[PDB]
Amino acid sequence: KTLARYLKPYWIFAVLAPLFMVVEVICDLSQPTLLARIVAEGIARGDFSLVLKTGILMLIVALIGAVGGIGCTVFASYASQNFGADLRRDLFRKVLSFSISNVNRFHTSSLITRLTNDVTQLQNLVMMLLRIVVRAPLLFVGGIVMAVSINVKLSSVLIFLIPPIVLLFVWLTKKGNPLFRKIQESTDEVNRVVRENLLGVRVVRAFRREEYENENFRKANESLRRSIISAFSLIVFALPLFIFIVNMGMIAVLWFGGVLVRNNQMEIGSIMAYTNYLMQIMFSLMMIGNILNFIVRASASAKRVLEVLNEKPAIEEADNALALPNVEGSVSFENVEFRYFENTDPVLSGVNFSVKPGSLVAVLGETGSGKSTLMNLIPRLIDPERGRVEVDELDVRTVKLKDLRGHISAVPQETVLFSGTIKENLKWGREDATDDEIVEAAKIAQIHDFIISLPEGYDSRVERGGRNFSGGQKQRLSIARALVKKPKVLILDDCTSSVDPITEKRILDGLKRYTKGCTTFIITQKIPTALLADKILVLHEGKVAGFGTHKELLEHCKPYREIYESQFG
């Protein structure tokens, strides 16, 4: 029902599309009889004055139907395509608003099918309807009325012919819809199988399990073709049944027709006219049955589209939220407790510590502590179940998302670059950042040395995933991109994990120099890189281990001593 809202602004083209079909059906049905009237007068009178004058008139009527016919296509194609194009941009906007969880509710491989194929199914429905939206009822309602004057007491037979025809498409709606949905569900599997081999082809080739994935694709390809033949069988089985009711209807006409001869209710030549009207009623009945078959395929695809739009994102901006134009960087945590799944144990719990603005903080701990998770609470990537996160001694939820995220920059643990060029990728933080600004940030991250040593400098092609560079270069670019945004709160999740110890030193000292009034946080694994920070924070198993100087944590904090031991002895 909500799908009509996208067809609402293009109602001008939607109302003119069936209007041209009325012009078309009139210029095609009345023209052969009108041409015969010219012929009829051509034998009655003849001459140059009557035959040649009507010869110009017949060419005009043929042009009206031609423009009326092509006019129906143009007014419908524009309406069907604009429905789909505006539906896609509204779905993509909703998928862009989705949180990491909302992208994992519907599978990443399913969302692609929803935003393309499921749009196309509804797009074809608008195209199929608009053509026979006025052609189907006018040839049925207008078809029975012309036959009403010919048959007497045979109206009861016509009314009794409605329920078996209604049952034919109602059964097709009951069994059809779940089976037609299984097609769009099986496409998500071949979508996933292809994406698995696409993202990580090097893993498949290294272990030679190409034949295993070939078998995995064959198992999903057979699953798709069998899901199609299961729903389409309903259409094949409805064909001999629907055709037989038309034949049974003709049998009812012939049986009752012979009785009318005995009673003298219908003339000897009246059977010719009624057989012509019967064809027009059955052809119009077939027109409704054809679009209804598209409806069961479109309804299964409509559910998939609407559920993406009606899906509330896990992270939402408050209606009465106050936008923050300036952020000081006063990071504070008040008994923060977060869990991903109800059945599993808490990831983070009882975390309470205040952070000074401008100061560099080193965060250390074992693999699976909650370093990345806690750092995701600051730009509101995850909402806690118990406790609250505070930025500038005010809650994160009360501050507008676009305003809050604009002041906080981060360097993820798994660096992911996108399509375009180095400059096109770096301008993610700030598109308004001029060449002079973006260069100085790259001189901090040591990447500028290499940026210029490329075929087109900052305009050197960067392929999806950053895969067209070295591990450390992707990482080196990722640092400079966060510095470009010019933050007041900075997050460095394993900043130099794929970088050499010499460049590592140059990057860290280059940061402190350009973070004089920015709350910098660095998730570090190394002790000598952790000493560069003012206050060293420790995390272990989930809870906060210790917050203080290096001299304090060696005697007080127990897990800190364990990490320190593996590096010095």
Add this chain to the structure above:
Amino acid sequence: QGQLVESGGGLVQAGGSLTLSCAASVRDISFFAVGWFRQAPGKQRELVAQMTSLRKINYADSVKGRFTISRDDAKNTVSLQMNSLKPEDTAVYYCHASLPGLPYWGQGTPVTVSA
């Protein structure tokens, strides 16, 4: 980089006492383990006292109990106190800097036990 300066030494009577100071310049001791070695004419570089950054001392069983190690973190110097000197102690004492596979040796302080 690394640099090691040795203070003290000289000659002392048998069954006495002496202090050996090992100063580490352009280096911070607080992170690496401290070491002490000795080389007598015809003897290998045998360990005297070894102490890791986490405070864990391992003296050699033949010099054990008598010798006492000291590390002054604010001064950045490692001291080795000698108690009751025997004729076996007549060797040139060396200081050692640890770090994971990145060491540095001392110059050598003179120690001669008279009988």
Add this chain to the structure above:
Amino acid sequence: TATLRRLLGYLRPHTFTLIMVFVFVTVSSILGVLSPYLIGKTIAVVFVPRRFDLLPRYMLILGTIYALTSLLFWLQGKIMLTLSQDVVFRLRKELFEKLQRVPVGFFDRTPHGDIISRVINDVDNINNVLGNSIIQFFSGIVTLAGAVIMMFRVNVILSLVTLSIVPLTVLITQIVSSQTRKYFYENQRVLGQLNGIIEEDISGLTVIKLFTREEKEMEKFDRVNESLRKVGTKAQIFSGVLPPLMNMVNNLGFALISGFGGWLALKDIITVGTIATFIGYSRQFTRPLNELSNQFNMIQMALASAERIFEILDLEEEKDDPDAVELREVRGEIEFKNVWFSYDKKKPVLKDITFHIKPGQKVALVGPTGSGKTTIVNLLMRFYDVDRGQILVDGIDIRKIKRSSLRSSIGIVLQDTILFSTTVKENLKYGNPGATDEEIKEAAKLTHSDHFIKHLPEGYETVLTDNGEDLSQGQRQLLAITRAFLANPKILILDAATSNVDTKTEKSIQAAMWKLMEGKTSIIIAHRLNTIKNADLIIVLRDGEIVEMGKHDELIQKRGFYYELFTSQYGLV
């Protein structure tokens, strides 16, 4: 022209079943022409004799005729549906299996979304040519031939007037069909373009929300979406422009029948009865001609999509040497001989790479960012080949040994960790499918992986999210380390093995890790120099040249680049 012959080329083994389709469609069409004529002929022998004389007798005859025709159309549709889906299935299978043969040098440069679209959308697009367009074509050619013989029986001279417009009918169809295929192909490439942004943005949305590129990626989408809208309308209009344009040619045709039947009607020749009868015969000839002309234009939609299908099938795939040797009794001998490699073939990445690794050696490849360490590893895995140089694995050259046997001897742990979306157990089981749970659980307990698997909702049977991002970044690494250690190869590559893994847990594996690493050749890449220091050979790389070589202690006293690299770890001077 060529694409059509190739498209129908998949129906070549189906010919035997297709002959039956031609038989069943012809019988049903002949019964479909006789049945509307028989009801109008026998009705004259109903009004004259009346009563139950001939009225109920003809119902049993017609009842069997209408039942046979209804069963014929059902049988036609049922056997075609199976054949249609099997041509689609084979086309889909031939694409995925071609990708597995195609080199890596395609995957990185081409967008992923366009590849998915070419299998999910473009093969779903060739469903309008199969079944429905096949039955109608064979029904279309029989009715056209069946009516042309009827027209020549009436008048040979009058049939030539209706045949003189036929070359002009083919003329207008060929102009429309050429443009219809032109716009429909552009529609499919832009669909794949849009599919590219969809896939790319979704797989990396966390990054987008972090740098607030919501409107920027929306405008990046809207630039392609509005372009898809502008080509989409042109494709749809041109597809449905032939039926009303052909209706105009029909109406102009009947205008000439009445036109010529007016000037000639003035003379003794041409009667009123002859014009009305010939119109009925021309109508039975125009109807299949309109359908065959429209079907040829409707199959252009599939022709444009199948054109994008053959582009992937025409791509140059990975080809082994004809004298491909399977490496038996693998030891672990690795040797490079003045290797020179470049990715873009313009800027040389590796400048003279030469070293010798004996079997059962721990080699530590070290150096700064973008040196060429991963490149040396990728060349060894034969993902890329040397421009001028030699790689000799166990004495035989890398080119002569088949990729199938070369990768059988080497197991890897990639720099950027990639995981499948199956159970944890099935993910670790990759590289060695013969591995029992006793092998899997004991190995995972040694690499500290089992510590976090027993805490998951379904344990070892916990179905992982795409790339396993539902775990910590280090946690994923420990999974990949086991996977390769389970695959048990004679040569192992630990390229950035413990980057995201903590210094404490990394040491906890080291002892048990080396026990599994003994009696095998392993090349380990790391910037954690103090962990790789105990390796049998240390190769220091710079710009793509070997600068320093030998063992740790020898290289420290040398005060070279390795010393500068090592001392840089500890910022205490």
